[PDB]
Design an enzyme around this catalytic site. Sequence first.
Site, mmCIF file in Angstrom:
data_model
loop_
_atom_site.group_PDB
_atom_site.id
_atom_site.type_symbol
_atom_site.label_atom_id
_atom_site.label_comp_id
_atom_site.label_asym_id
_atom_site.label_seq_id
_atom_site.Cartn_x
_atom_site.Cartn_y
_atom_site.Cartn_z
ATOM 1 N N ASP A 1 0.867 -1.197 0.000
ATOM 2 C CA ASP A 1 0.000 0.000 0.000
ATOM 3 C C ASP A 1 0.898 1.240 0.000
ATOM 4 O O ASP A 1 1.791 1.333 -0.856
ATOM 5 C CB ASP A 1 -0.984 -0.150 1.165
ATOM 6 C CG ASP A 1 -2.109 0.871 1.136
ATOM 7 O OD1 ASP A 1 -1.914 1.992 1.654
ATOM 8 O OD2 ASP A 1 -3.196 0.550 0.593
ATOM 9 N N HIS B 1 -6.934 -7.222 -0.393
ATOM 10 C CA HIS B 1 -5.852 -6.239 -0.366
ATOM 11 C C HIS B 1 -4.738 -6.606 0.623
ATOM 12 O O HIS B 1 -3.563 -6.304 0.369
ATOM 13 C CB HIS B 1 -6.453 -4.875 -0.023
ATOM 14 C CG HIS B 1 -5.463 -3.758 0.033
ATOM 15 N ND1 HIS B 1 -4.660 -3.415 -1.032
ATOM 16 C CD2 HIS B 1 -5.170 -2.882 1.023
ATOM 17 C CE1 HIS B 1 -3.915 -2.376 -0.699
ATOM 18 N NE2 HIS B 1 -4.203 -2.038 0.544
#
Lengths: 298, 296
Positions: A109, A279
Amino acid sequence: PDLADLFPGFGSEWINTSSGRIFARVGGDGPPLLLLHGFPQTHVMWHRVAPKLAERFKVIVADLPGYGWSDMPESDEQHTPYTKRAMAKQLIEAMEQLGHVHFALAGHDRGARVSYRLALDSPGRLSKLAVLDILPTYEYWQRMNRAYALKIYHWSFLAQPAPLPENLLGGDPDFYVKAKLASWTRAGDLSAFDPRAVEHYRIAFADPMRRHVMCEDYRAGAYADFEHDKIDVEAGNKIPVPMLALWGASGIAQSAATPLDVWRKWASDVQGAPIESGHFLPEEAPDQTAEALVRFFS
Amino acid sequence: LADLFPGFGSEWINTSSGRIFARVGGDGPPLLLLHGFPQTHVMWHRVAPKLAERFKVIVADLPGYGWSDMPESDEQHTPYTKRAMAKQLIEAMEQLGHVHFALAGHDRGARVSYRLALDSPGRLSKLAVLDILPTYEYWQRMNRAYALKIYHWSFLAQPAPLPENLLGGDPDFYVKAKLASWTRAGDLSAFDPRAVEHYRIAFADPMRRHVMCEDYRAGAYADFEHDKIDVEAGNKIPVPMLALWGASGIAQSAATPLDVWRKWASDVQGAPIESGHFLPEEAPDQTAEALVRFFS
């Protein structure tokens, strides 16, 4: 005893830089490997994969500048300290304090955005690079359409001028951080996370100054970070460092495009693979994530 | 709350989907006026008196807004789609004996208006829309720059209860922030303080805020689908139409408004007005004169 220690055997280190302290857990022996988290998490997101990596590497698990227990440098009108160029410079200085001028790097991220910007600015610092569930910032903005605008709405919401996101996030912060964690997993709830890790993320998000930093990060993400990427892509600059791109089968990166095909335009030596996960690869699919990192870095 | 329409009556109109509140004044041909977000019918208080010199003016709260009833929504946000709102307002006007009327809308109310004209053109003599492009066009032009300008189109469309929970912490801040940010001046100077209190009290009700999010959810899904079918089939609005926009407003950020509306309508006139998004309050005299001239 308030927050749990999820890195048994790792030391704790406060590393001084000219912009403030970086907090990190350090373990293992061998070649150095820096692991960087993203939003809305801290270094503890790596707690299921770091012990496996510490079998072969000296693992340094750091809180990004302004996140977790790292110091928060004062921002300015261009969000400079929270640009990925500035964060990368600060982390290079931190690693020099430990004697590491050539190291391996893996980011997730926002930490993956620090990582590829570091590779473009200072490739000689890296032996190998791994990015988890991202495409370059330029690519997200250039592919902005209705469907992606709805999926990553927070890229435009958190980049609104202060104090609008800050005030709204203060409306229900516990709810917001938990909703982000759950909504981006494959399961759709919090059952993939260790509850002790969730407490770390919730406590960090409870601090108003920490939430403001995160908004500055996304503000830089909409402005300076995009411009910095645009220069490289218009000049045809590529990452020369050997690179691994991992992404979740139901993650964020695969909504925008075919990840391995995108990264080929940005890097000359890249391989990749999908992981059965949302994710949060290191927590949803830790065994598969660690296997792929171990094989790649060794 | 102040009465900002001296001499106007007050009407509660029954429909199958709930009551519509409206102020009614004047005499002459019927003209319906529709507001948008985050406002109520009182936004027309500076312009409706000029219109009432010549028209029977009906100033209505949208379904779910202001003092109108709030039909319960469903998984497709059906009652807050513009197709459904248009049908409900057609029924309300029929209750007054108006089966053929003129129509002007701003913001969300302008989206009800052009959808009404596509679905049921025979109901309208003339149509005016203020500071909008069609919903399809906003989504088709959603690039980095525009995503940052109208972020609320994607934020308020997030699944419940995410926007509702964030808005509930300090509702007063958000409604005033939106009023201020879309004006030319960037503050609240253009609004009558008595009108701001109307908007603030409406926004303070959690049920009313949920309705507004359902409206934006429809705007991201079914409203877009309905527009997509019409544009890809080449269906144009056949009603004579006026498009007004603010020189500092939202519509002109995405594109040149008149060129876009010519794609959607066969008889369009258009004019800019020196104003932000809130034409009837930032530029009352210019707005009223443009409407009176077009509708007569």
